[PDB]
Nucleic acid binder design. Structure first.
Length: 237
RNA sequence: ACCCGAAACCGGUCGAUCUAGCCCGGGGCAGGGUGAAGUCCCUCAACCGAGGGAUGGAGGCCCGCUAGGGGUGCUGAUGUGCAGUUCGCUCCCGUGACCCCGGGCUAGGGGUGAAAGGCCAAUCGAGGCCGGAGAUAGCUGGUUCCCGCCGAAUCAUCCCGCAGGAUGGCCUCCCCGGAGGUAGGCGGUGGGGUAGAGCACUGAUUGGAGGUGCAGGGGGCGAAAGCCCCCGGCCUCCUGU
RNA sequence: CGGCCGCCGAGACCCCGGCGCACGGACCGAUUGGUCCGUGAUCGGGUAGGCGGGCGUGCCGGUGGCGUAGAAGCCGGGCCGUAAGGUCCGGUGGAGCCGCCGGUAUCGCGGAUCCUGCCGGGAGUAGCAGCGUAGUCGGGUGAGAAUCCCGACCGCCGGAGGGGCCAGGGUUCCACGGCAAUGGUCGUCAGCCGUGGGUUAGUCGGUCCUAACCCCGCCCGUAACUCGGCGCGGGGGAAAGGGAAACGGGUUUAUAUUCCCGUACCGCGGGGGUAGGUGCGGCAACGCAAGCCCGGAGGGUGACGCCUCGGGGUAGGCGGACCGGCCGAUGAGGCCGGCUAAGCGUAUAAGCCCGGGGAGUGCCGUAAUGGCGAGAACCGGGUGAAAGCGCGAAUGGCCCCCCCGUUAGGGGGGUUCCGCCGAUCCCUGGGGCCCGUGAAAAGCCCUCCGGGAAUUCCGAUCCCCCGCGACCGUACCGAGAACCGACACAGGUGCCCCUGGGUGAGAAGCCUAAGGCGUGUCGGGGGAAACCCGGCCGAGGGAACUCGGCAAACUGGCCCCGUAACUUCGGGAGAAGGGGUGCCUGCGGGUGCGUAACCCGCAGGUCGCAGUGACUAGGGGGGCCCGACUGUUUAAUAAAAACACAGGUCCCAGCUAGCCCGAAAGGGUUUGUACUGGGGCCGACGCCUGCCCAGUGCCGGUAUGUGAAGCCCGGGUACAACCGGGUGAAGCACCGGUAAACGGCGGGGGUAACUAUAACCCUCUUAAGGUAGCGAAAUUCCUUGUCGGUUAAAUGCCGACCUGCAUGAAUGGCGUAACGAGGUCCCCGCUGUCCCCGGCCGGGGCCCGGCGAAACCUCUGCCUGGCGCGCAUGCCAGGGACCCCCGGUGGGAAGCGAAGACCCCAUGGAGCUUUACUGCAGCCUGCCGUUGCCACACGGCGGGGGGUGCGCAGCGUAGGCGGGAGGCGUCGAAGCCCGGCCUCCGGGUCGGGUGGAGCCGUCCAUGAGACACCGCCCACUCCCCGCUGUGUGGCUAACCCCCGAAAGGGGGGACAGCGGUAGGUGGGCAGUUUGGCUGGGGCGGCACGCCUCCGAAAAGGUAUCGGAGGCGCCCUAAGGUCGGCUCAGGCGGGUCAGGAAUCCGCCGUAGAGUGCAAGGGCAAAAGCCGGCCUGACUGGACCCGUAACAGAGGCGGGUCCAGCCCCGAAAGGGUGGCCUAGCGAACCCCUGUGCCUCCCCGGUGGGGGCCAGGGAUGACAGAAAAGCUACCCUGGGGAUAACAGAGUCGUCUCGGGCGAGAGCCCAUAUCGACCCCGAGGCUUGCUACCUCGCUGUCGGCUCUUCCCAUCCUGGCCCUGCAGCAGGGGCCAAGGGUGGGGGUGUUCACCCAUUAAAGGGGAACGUGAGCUGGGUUUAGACCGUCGUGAGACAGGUCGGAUGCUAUCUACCGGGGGUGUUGGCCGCCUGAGGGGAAGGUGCCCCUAGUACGAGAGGAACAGGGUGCCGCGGCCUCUGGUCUACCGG
RNA sequence: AAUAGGCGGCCGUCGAGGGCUCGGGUAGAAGACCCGGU
């Protein structure tokens, strides 16, 4: 048989590679040595549209002379001042350790471990809810609905990511979809395994139906995991 | 291993000037129409409202031999062509998912695919070049001077055997051994169950006569113990197979 | 037909002569032999094949020779040899060659669709047309001119055939000298040949920067590398991105932004001054020369998308005036020239600012959006582009005039204004859009920070002057001849960048200026045809054509009225439909200063057939199916209903995740983080999406069973191997969820008979029985279902019903506006599609002069009937034909372009699928190592100790056996009391104390007796020590992950990762298998291993998918022996007792029985009944059968020897079943037995060997093993199917014999049962004889011909024939046998006419004649079947038709010979051809014959239509590229 | 028409008759055919 699209994506060819040269750059926090035990004040210079981010970006210049790129929270104003550190006030756009953030607050850009630079709640329109604070861990409810425990020293930014409601308007046109997916080099348009040939897909065949149940085992080898992978259930409930 | 021919398999290499996809940087698309959002104006009334007039340039919008791109029908010309896919008329898109160019990347069980098993240099249900390699076949074709002597077979058993082999039968050449041999006929000693014929067994087969109540059936007939016939069955004989 | 006579006729038979062969004999050879004689009626064909001899070729060892007085070789002849061949003669040739003996070898050719080279017929033929049809006249050159050169005329392109210039080409560029070859002809010409030349840069480009991306070093992986890779350091990477600087005139045969002249600019360095160091004007925006050098930082610029509009400007264009020139008539008018580069200096517009000012019952402004106390009107100013203006620059260029003109030259004039339009070319601002955000760096400018030098000094971005500026490209084409495609290729690259006037909206079409060309290169002739390609027209009809309106035709621009169903309210829509359109004269209006330019109206006059007059330029409407739309696809037969799409919904994943690449290292998603990344399915929109978890999947659990290695325990082994048990993860077993997961959603009877028929209803049945919708459907076989509409006529289309073979709800159901080169039906209009074809034009065809092939070719080439491998130009018998050439049409050569589309075979392949076989990755998991430290719990071990033992009986709560009736007691005991304790709360054990001297049987009970004492245990449990693991909790120090250059910090953590091993899962990836026979193959069956009867033909043998049946066991008796008896059936007689229970007598040849089929054999037995036994045994020999003759592994059977036995008195018998079926190699393993053996020797454990028995291969003389191919490939097969031929005729079509009868009587007017005999090859089938290195299918169109079994026309006979008509039959093949509807249809059905509207053959006639609707590839949909790939003689949409005629054939046209010398003219007609004619109707006979009436003929006599044929242009119509007019 | 014909006329034992060339169609693909040519 022939390879699948997922199999061909793992080889890193330009058909599947992300065009990470037209983007504004990675959004990570300043190194943790600056933030620990000290509070830094920065000024917002500009708010721009990152080609592939699903969220606006902002440029922040700090008093020590460091220029950084951050994910702009909703309501962030050009020329406003922000603070990062343990002593930062509780306001939108300020970054604090999770131990100093009061319960019931909305946060985003949470570090998985202290100093990694931020890994969670980064998409546009997303926020997480601080639930409980303990000397050993801090519980936050993530956008997926899961309650996750983080180290008290993990950093997060107060507010909600700008760009929410993006899915309220339909894409309408295949041309609109074409531009949207070409901006980030995502495989588009997409074919169907049932209309593929038998050599190409497990579901391929002259008759456009799957010849086997579409729920595939978690232990299936690569080149076989298609359809519903390790599905607990199917259908509409 | 007498000689030539396979489709195919395997190794290492060569190709994205064709074409497919994606990235960086560039060039291009006469003229006309329609009239979305938006911004309004005027009149009569005023508790409602009704009517009229503008501006505005959006669209995978419309007409279009602009350029450029595509290829529906004629199943037209040509069909040892101008051309190893071209020409004419007709037709379709023509501001967009648009067309084209220079620089790059993805390489063969791999790439790429708006998915036709399409495209990857006139080659694609696994590219090309050299090597394994003079590959293999029970299948097709071929196999070069003359005279002389003898001269077949397509029948039995076995094989994943049925277009192929092996053991025998039938042919030919040479040698040992040394007195019998038998294709034809006559007479004799034995064996046989075919043709024909026949009913003595086994099984069929038309009618009639006699015997047998014979566990049969049909009627009449009787409290009930059984009778009277017809038919049927079973034997013998005659008759026709 | 019954006989005879004579002849003729083979290689047969006879005779003479010759050869060889086989055998025997004599004689003679220094290697197979030679000569001669004898016999051959009993020797003489020959494929496969065997054997013997001989001929020829190259070279070696010998031997004997030839040759320049002519070797080899070659050409024509003579002789010899059966022959393969040898040798001579004549000629050419000029240098080597041969006989014999013995060796040796790339040793002998007609084939292999053989290889290489050369040459024929096709052929002096095709081609030199189609998309741009271009030449003519006079002159010149030259041996030579359609083709070369000049002038004139006539033409083509003119948003490209013109101008510029990349890539590519590499000298093709220029001049001179030429035509052997090249150039589609010629050539004096050339992109050709020869000889000489040609490319000049500080400013143009490379060079510099960086983008996507690439390379090198370190590092890591790999057995390793030239292989893979993250991170660090370095470098490269654009001749169209960024990026210092030049523009006119002139010059050469060929270079010029490069050379010369003129005028400039840029970078570096230097010299002399100056500004500044130490300076001013403005409130301000700002104006300014506004210090030098080194280092750093900041800002700006470089620096950016798409759509759209306003403003300013420039090229270019138009009109007018004026001066020169040309034309015109020295009229009017038209045409030509009237030009201005960089650089330097110079400023406004928009935009943005800066002062003053202080508004709203609001003012201000734009094309538009808009702005204002967060500061508007309004008055001043600052900065700020493209341009214009001045110098450059009129000594230059352009135009004109004059003198000299033999060559060569010299001078004089002008080059000026106004108005309008105006870019796609520049500058500058608004506005709008993004789920889309549309590059970086070098470089340059400014500002700011530190540092350095400067006072009789430092010193510029300002002025003047001077010097230097490297390397490489530069010619030419740039394409219908300079590139790629083999080409001077109609393709592609590059149309990549640019465009005067008129008409016109237009970069449209047409004409035309400039520029270019006549080289999209063979010319000439012609009523010079037929026919083909391209174009124009066509009377009357108007789709009657056809699968289908294919093609063509109608409409057409603009203005004004007007515009439907439906709808997603946007659309449909230019729906539909109607009116007008030219020219001239004159007015009015809009913007405008304008009587400049553009645009919009009005009135009148007038001409034609026609006024968007050419050119340009929609035909329209109504239903249905499918897909929402724009878009994409099989480059080269399918553009679609297929794919994509926005939208819906489901699944996985919190990041060291999920999914994926890899051998690993590392990596893609990822500069990402659930509004995200990845994985399915449906597919806009509207309404909806029902039931089922039994099956197959997936997910969770897993108490319990199984479950590998490892570990532990016992046995074994002087140690192991080996055996048994325990622990035992994952996975299965099991349980639960899950269907927008794969799929499924049934089946019988009767009813409610206010008829009949329906579901209310009761019985099996599953996980459940299909809900809403839709339905003869792209799904319906019957089917052309039935009804209604459409037509004269309907296999169509639409509406409806439901009997849904085999619809149905996200493999979605139904509906749907808009959309579509999708399929489909109808209507108006239109037309040469058709009736029915006829004219005209241009190019071919044809002839003449040139260049000049190819496909193909065994040799040839006439027919009828035949034989034949079954459809012959060549054979047999006949018929006919003198020979050659030109033009044409394609019947045949099963013509040419191919080692068969289709089918079968091959122990041949490839792609794909799966619960086929066997494997490899990935994934899950146990164990060992990395791997450490604190505790807790649990499960097993060793050392000890505890309480805890109701079987039934009892003083009593005996568990087991042993010694053992006494043992205990100050070595302190009963009977009293409370405490803890286990406990079947039965009832026992025990600390303390009142207590100070007794307690149990032994005896009997108890299936087994002592709480008499002494011992070992067994059943549960706990605890003290040590060992062992499993799980749980915690820790950091290994290890990992993050931040950081590092230091170090943080997070996880003995997990994970890595290494080794063990089990599972695993079409993700591979190698394979999927048998054979077969009246093709498949399905079926097993004729695939055995036994019996028939076939089978009286010895033996004998086959078929021949006929009739059995076997894959069973029996300790159904085996051995001995003794005794006689069976089945029937008759007669008997208590219950009968048809049948038991008994007596007789007949009784087996009619019974013998285990099981059939055949054979069995009567004092081989049957039945009894006694005794195991010979169904051990060691061996020979023989028969499977398998004749005639080969055999294995197996079966028979005759015996010996041992030990059985029965019998003995003889005698017994090696299974009375005989013929009931079964199986190698290797391996198990068992019995008693011997041999294992590497220097010996012992032990273990292994190997010899003999016997057993476990099975049924495809049974012994592989381990599923499918699709329509994407298919290869080698083959007429050993083998489909089409066609051949054989046959069951079947089909058509007859005949007899006569039961039916016909009022009457068999035969007509029909003719039941039976019987035939003909044809027109239906189908059967066989498999020709054809698989290809013979192209059905239907239709065109065209020719034949048969009669006659539909009509001609003539007759019978009749249940009155007439008109009918029914049946006979002769007769000259003629006719037509037009339409649905359907691909043949056929069949239907419609209106007709004399009738016949059936058949010709390779189911006819594709080198056509068409391509069906069938039968590759794409796609629906239904059904299959787990799946997929399949369906089931529907449905699309899906290629090649040709230069060699021979013959036919149609026409010519040159010759012959016809006993040549020529002209007129005739004859032997033979051949014809249909040259065929057939309706009307009047009259006649309302007559006939007939009751109704009705209704015929002979004869007249007229006329249609079909067919042969002619003609007076009449009519068509055309009329002569001609005339608008 | 292989029995390959009949008749009238002109010619031979220099010469009747004909062809090319010429002007044109009652004809035509080349050939052929038909009229005219002092």
């Amino acid at each position: 048989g022939k390879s699948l699209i997922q199999q061909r994506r793992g080889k890193g060819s330009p058909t599947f590679k992300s065009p990470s040269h037209r983007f504004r750059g990675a959004v990570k926090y300043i190194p943790l040595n600056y933030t620990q035990e000290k509070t830094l004040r920065g000024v917002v210079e500009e708010i721009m549209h990152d080609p592939g981010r699903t969220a606006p970006v902002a440029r922040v210049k700090f008093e020590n002379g460091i220029e950084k790129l951050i994910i702009a929270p909703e309501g962030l104003l050009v020329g406003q001042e922000i603070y990062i550190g343990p002593d930062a006030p509780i306001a939108v756009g300020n970054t604090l350790p999770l131990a100093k953030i009061p319960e019931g607050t909305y946060v985003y850009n949470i570090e998985g471990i202290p100093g990694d630079g931020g890994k969670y709640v980064r998409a546009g329109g997303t926020y997480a809810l601080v639930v409980s604070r303990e000397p050993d861990k801090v519980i936050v409810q993530l956008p997926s609905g899961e309650l996750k425990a983080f180290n008290p020293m993990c950093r997060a930014t107060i507010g909600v990511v700008a760009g929410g409601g993006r899915l309220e308007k339909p894409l309408v046109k295949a041309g609109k979809a074409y531009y949207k997916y070409k901006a980030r080099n995502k495989f588009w348009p997409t074919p169907r395994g049932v209309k593929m040939n038998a050599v190409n897909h497990p579901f391929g065949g002259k008759e456009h139906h799957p010849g086997k149940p579409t729920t595939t085992s978690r232990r299936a080898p690569p080149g076989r995991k298609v359809g519903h992978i390790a599905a607990r259930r199917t259908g509409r409930r």
